[model samples]
Target chain A: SNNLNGMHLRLGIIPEMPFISEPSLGCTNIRDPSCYTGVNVEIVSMMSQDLNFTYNFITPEDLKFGGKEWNGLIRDLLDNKTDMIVVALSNNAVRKADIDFSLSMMDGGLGALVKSDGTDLSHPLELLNQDKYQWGVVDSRNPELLLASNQNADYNRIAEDAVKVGSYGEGLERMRAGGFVFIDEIPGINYATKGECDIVQIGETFQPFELAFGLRKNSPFKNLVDTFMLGIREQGVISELYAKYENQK
Target chain B: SNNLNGMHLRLGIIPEMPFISEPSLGCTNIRDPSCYTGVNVEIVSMMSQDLNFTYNFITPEDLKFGGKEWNGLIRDLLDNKTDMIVVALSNNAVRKADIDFSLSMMDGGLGALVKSDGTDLSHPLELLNQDKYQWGVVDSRNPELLLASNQNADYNRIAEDAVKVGSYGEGLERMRAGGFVFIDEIPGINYATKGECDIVQIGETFQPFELAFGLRKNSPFKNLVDTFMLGIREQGVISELYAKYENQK
Candidate 1:
């Protein structure tokens, strides 16, 4: 039974800015329960209150998203170090084989960040064929796997020429330095590029991999988590949270 | 194991117009295996071919749609008289308690059919409040349960005043006869009102209850059926089927 009443849960949190992050003006220590706060933090807080559970945040030391060999938030869930993950995580066919994801709370897809001067290009291959710009994706992210797994020659060329950055911050840094483009999930791109007149999210959004929380495969809490997700979605709570973050600089 | 190689299955088919029905000019009897043909028939035929299974159609003795007590095609599944239903059955919380539904294949909601001269009313309540016109719903269908379960005073008043229609045909007849409005699923309403100068579907679509196939609760074949649905959806096969029907008179 997934009765979480009075249960203390360890939630794996990734400080992906605007989704989950250390509160800017609150607790100073990362380990402080009050330190973390963001869209996911608020969502989880509400769920915990409704389910009668207490939870604390746990950040993955390696800071990697799920990929082959799973080390990071995905590893924490598998190692049973965290009860569930409460950040923006992609739901894809590969991940579905290893873990169960709650129904998506956000409707984002893959998008790219480029310098405003780069001008808009319609397709991924169009950008790939160009010699004026370099492209990269964050390490161990869905975008990497998406291009890497495709057998098409054009996509293979795109994957081969693409540099693998360690994080979204690193990818954005390369993109901001000029002559480089960064590809990542749309929400992260939107959050990072917001208010920066020199940087913009361009090209069509691709691979509509919606965001959801991850739980251990076949966990008893799956049903409860899903029902809670449905209720909040129906109440328009998630969109309200997105609006709060999207309104931020 | 849901291996269907050489398996023969009984598929309960409701002769819902534009979804499942006897061939317009080919078959003379409803009991013939080759008599049934429509969007669902084509879908099941494709699935059967892909899954290496053969199936025959079984029509419910009584042409009732599911309600508080199951009857018609829904009862056929519950009574173990049919393996699955291959028509546009709705996926609702109430029916979900009794049976499992495949992922929705169509994106339709609730809509109303009114005489062209009735003039457009924006809300259901507006139509219900008028003394010069009458409103009705198809018997034992989702719309009945939808209004009957709502506690909103206006909704309750609407339900109380609504005439119970035994079929879409009956409701359409009343609508055609004069001064009547019929509420039904968007797909059915659209199909019945198309190419008609005197009838039109009015008001915003309500209660987005998409359509899917139905199977008994906890059926082993559920996984296989859902996978097929996902594949067809991804392939645009379902939309293509809808386009074929929608283009017809």
Candidate 2:
């Protein structure tokens, strides 16, 4: 009956480094089937058929999480241009007034995905025993992404020779190509790791995230998306979606 | 994939209820399908497609969780009658020498599913005034499922009023018609309450259970199921699969 209504939803894929919308502009591989892939991509594929609605996915002007304000796809959904955001979007309490969240798929943070080509193979959050390494980071952080309390001294020393890409997929490509380090969420990073297989997340991973399906406030489609989520969860597919790429991510 | 090279596998399902399996041998609704709906049934549905394997799901000759030694499916897997036990099987140290187990979905324990037609919907686990009321429990314990300390006296009080029916399904049907109680594991009981929309559990819950996949001591498939479990965990769906039904079962 959802499809009987004949609404082909416009699904936005924020190109946050992973394949929510493949950031390649072009490909390193042979072809493209218009088959864009990644976390949310897999979700859309699952939801569309079961929920009986087709969707067209695209990236927003910016890929950052909805911070103190709306940017990128967050704005797209609020402005009614897009029906949903299917990336690994952060489900923050501050934005609840403007939208609805299905349920968190995974907890996320500034997962400092440290880069290493060395052989120790130990966990990363521990100090890199490597004699020398490079660091890539944003100009600042609220804190491990923290401040005064934790990795203050070490973070202070990550003084790098890296440029800000603001592009998750490119950042992943650069990370795989062996650049410095700047840890964001894990979806994109893990996607790259699986393909390249030369990386590891080193450190105590913090899982304070409750990432969920993002939708519009008072929208007609909210119940449908929420129900579909119940579909995937009931089908026992959630962790398989995220957990498969976790360690390598 | 346990399905690699297009292996057609025989998978096991146990009628554990609310979870491990859907226990309604007969449905109150006419449209419930020829469907053998249950926890691992969905798991088999998902894996059969993804891993490229074909499987015929069957309940073993026995459903015991490998007591004193191999009782039901444990014996089946050992005898090669079934290729895998996808049902909610117990993970125990005693069985370590005899077979392998996939890490737990959610640790299950002696859940106290309380019954009352009274109304106080704030949180489902608390009883109204904590005054005297009948308690339902299995006859013994190690004993989260105890002889239940105070209960040797109380269970003796319960006397022949209870039934030691081995299946969680019949237990639920009788509980619905009115059998009042069960030991720790949850799946069946929860599904009924959701369907009946009346029963509720009245206790704190814990995940001390090590419910897992069962296999022969040296079966080659252990690693595959373990890896698949890693998929479940990584996807972040474990708790959702369990919690969505926690209250009733």
Candidate 3:
């Protein structure tokens, strides 16, 4: 009982998958915590045991990944509301200001989705300026990632043709419906791959974001988390995580 | 092809269960679009076909459910982002202000969790002040729901005792590590139930928030969504959704 003084802390998250996200439906065998499986889920299990730290995970239904500040995860970290943000929080310049991001747990990026039927634009983003194609950028993303702008017009357009991608459900629905295209993250495009009305990702590649753990600014535990993440990455722990939800890179 | 003009639309979502959540990971056959399942997922499938529409799904890493205003989903709705939110968004005073909530698909509530370790506290919320017992609430929850407040002293004192319950994985990890308790939604608690640390729910159940498809205010399709939901509920789609996720209540 005296071990690590029961070093219990709070870890924040909302399912991101492949990284610090839920791997499976927490539905099957309902009640068995093992049902809540995934890369981050397993990583937490391994890290907690290896590091001799006892912690619980918490998710903010409202605290989602926001651009610039922790309007969601990073925001909670700066507020010191949780001990760590353990989800697919992309490490961007605006976010690094407030918290310590562990390391790139994921090779994350901005991507796009178009109907399975057909497409004239090859790279999806090519339609960034065209008004006819209703391009939706999830409201929570960095505008620039989707070629959006603080001031639209020449950049993002008359600010028209933009819709906030809400849920994967909506994204899939809209893109499949028609005349709808979306700029999304790579992982989302990955997870969204089901082949129904058959929405497909824009392409196979993108600029990567080192998605990592977002911790309090200058957190005393920064080194500890970064070190732990690096160690796990070296140990094949991270590799296996990718194997579960994504093709191991 | 003239059926509802074969109109395809977008559905917004995160991996909420029973409702519009986690389609691919039913981890079943998962090839055809039929692989996507949920009260909302399946409902969308049925509605799209029956109601004469088609759509796709999308989840933004940055979007998450916050209070009243959207840390993600509701904001997307208010911003005129997506066509429909395909998750079990809870209806309350704060959120309804921004968007319209569809009829209840599930009775979602603020529930408590405790380590299966033998404990004296029965109602679960009793130890809000106990240091030995750490209480966690999904950060996105309205503090008042779990008897939390930013202003009240005793309330805030206990309020500080709460941690952000990120996902079922971390919840299971923390509780299993011992000296930890969490207050997550019924679905979260249901998801958190696992063979691992053996967490259990507190008998104390608060009147739940009606988790349903929250759409844009004055949505032209509100009547349509309700009609679809009503038809599904009567047709056992919603019931089966609970069976897939939680106990049918």
Candidate 4:
């Protein structure tokens, strides 16, 4: 019932390490098709096989998810430049305004990443108001907004002093350099710290949410995708996928 | 944006303890308006207030869910006698064919219930082919369908010999009387065993699914309700509700 009859879809993705990534040599150009591989790429590949659709991956030119006005993968989706976003995108209210999310692929939460020798706090909330360690989150991401939205003094202070952890390589580098804490979703933190050993996830996870694929609002494909997602959830396909990939971490 | 503007809705429910139930003296009749109370009742009350609607509860006269053709709460929903089934309905594909579902209210799974003195297997799958134990599940529910759909020797044997535990009260009573295993969703098993010291939950949870509100196929209210559900999920309203009610048990 969910067969797409070989329909083609453009899947927007960011090279967010374990979620989606460019090859070591990378693609030859920005428009390079299907030149990505990772958890999400594999996920979409499986969905395509099951749903009988073909898809290729794309990334924003600047490789940044824009704030308020929206850009990057979300913009690509709204402007009809992409059919869907296959990434670890949070299904938050802000994004819900512009897109529909498939049934959540996994539970997600914000976690603190710090050098192994850095001060170990029992919870992320404890990191608040501490002058010794400066913290930051990837700019324009859901973690930044989650912190910004909280009215508590702790949350306010953290948001006020938080630096913009530049995307990808530089951000991970900053965290590795120590004294700077990085706040990111659980899976990202786990995957980032996996082989590094020196960087470890610390503090209790907070700001829980679900990660899902983003599609244009009211997309005709929503129901079929959700149905397929539900089937995978019931049959343990998603969990198996997670285990296969996360075990590598 | 999700306001129902005082539209009156007929909500279908079964008197499943802690989900929806008649008062101490029982409802005067099946058509009694708003004569139910439980976690679902409180949930819908909160939803109605937030969504700006009015609703009343109705149960099928026989109080039994039909096996194949459909009856009771699902039948009422399918026949248009009710606007929605506002109980712990599973969002499985079989049901998906007949109705749409809101974003899941909570994660769910199949678990086994046994008398404290009964043989304690590490998992439900281990109980298969054990002649010493007679197992049954609530008739016509998702658990039954899930077992019936499984082709594994263990699953097939369980399904083939499984008894239809009738409906709510009698089925629970049969378990309470001993020598019988009741297979049900995790929440249902937990709720049923909460105060009953003799009955204990056993085995690993399996057949994972999401519990969601059932809406008619292509219901106009689906999107609005889903939006509201997502908001509550993001804001922790559902978890708070679960904590409030489940704590009482």
TM-score, each model? Answer: 0.48, 0.38, 0.44, 0.48
After superposition on all C-alphas, the RMSD of every candidate to the true structure, in Å, is: 22.6, 23.8, 20.3, 23.3
Residue range A81-175, candidate 4, lDDT tens digits: 57888888887777787688889788899888888664566676767646667778877778777777765668766776788865756667888
Model 3, range B1-249, lDDT digits (tens) per residue?
224434445566776554544556555532234556556666677778776766666554554665543556555544433567777666777666667788767677776677666763677547753556877655555433335533446545555656766553555567767777766677645654634456677677764677778787776567777877887788886777667655532
Ranking by TM-score: 1, 4, 3, 2
Task: Please give the lDDT score for candidate 2.
Answer: 0.54
lDDT of 2 by residue, B1-249 (tens): 244535546566665554554445675532222346655666666666666656665565555544443556666665455677777765655555577777665555545454445642233122222433333332221122223222345433333334455555544555555325443455434555564655566555433456677776766556666777778767976655565545435
Q: Which candidate tops DockQ?
A: 3
- Candidates in order have lDDT scores of 0.78, 0.54, 0.61, 0.75
Which regions of candidate 4 deviate over 4 angstroms?
A1-249, B24-34, B151-153
Q: Which DockQ values do the candidates obtain, in the order shown?
A: 0.01, 0.01, 0.01, 0.01
Q: Model 4 clash pairs?
A: none
Error of 2 at A204 (Å): 1.5
List model 4's recovered fraction of native interface contacts, to 2 decimals: 0.00
Ranking by lDDT: 1, 4, 3, 2
Let me know the TM-score candidate 2 reaches against the reference structure: 0.38
Q: Count the backbone clashes (under 3 Å) in each candidate.
A: 0, 34, 49, 0
Query: Across residues B137-160, which tens digit of lDDT does each residue of candidate 4 receive?
Result: 877788887777765667767777
lDDT of 1: 0.78
CAPRI-style quality class for the chain A–B interface of candidate 1:
incorrect
